[PDB]
Amino acid sequence: FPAPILRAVPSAEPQAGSPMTLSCQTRLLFSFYKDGRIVQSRGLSSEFQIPTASEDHSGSYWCEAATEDNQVWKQSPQLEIRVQG
């Protein structure tokens, strides 16, 4: 059971104002981090939605897949988001 891959869809470079989703690709619960702080706490969903990309969304993100009691616990490599414009 390998480390999650964090993917940006459609890309890590959304145009400003456009929607994108972060996907934690891997019972596991998923959390998402930006620049050290949680942006979505543990949950069923392996997706972190950003429906309107703006400057504050640019940064270094990573995700975490883990069971409730942390018997299983793994994080992804970081992924930089660069909102364009």
Side-chain angles (χ1 to χ4, degrees):
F1 172 55
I5 301 138
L6 183 63
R7 307 182 51 241
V9 181
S11 88
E13 295 183 7
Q15 296 294 316
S18 68
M20 62 161 306
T21 317
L22 266 35
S23 171
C24 197
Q25 219 84 81
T26 200
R27 163 195 39 81
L28 303 178
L29 303 180
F30 302 92
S31 51
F32 292 80
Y33 290 77
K34 178 185 183 287
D35 296 316
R37 81 185 178 210
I38 283 100
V39 285
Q40 177 168 303
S41 52
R42 293 199 177 181
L44 287 176
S45 176
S46 53
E47 312 268 14
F48 170 70
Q49 317 189 267
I50 301 166
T52 304
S54 64
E55 296 203 340
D56 56 288
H57 291 122
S58 300
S60 176
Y61 294 72
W62 58 86
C63 71
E64 183 185 295
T67 57
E68 268 190 52
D69 58 354
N70 303 332
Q71 286 301 313
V72 173
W73 193 108
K74 301 210 164 203
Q75 275 185 349
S76 71
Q78 112 291 356
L79 178 74
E80 191 195 15
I81 303 294
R82 298 159 230 108
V83 183
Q84 301 293 299

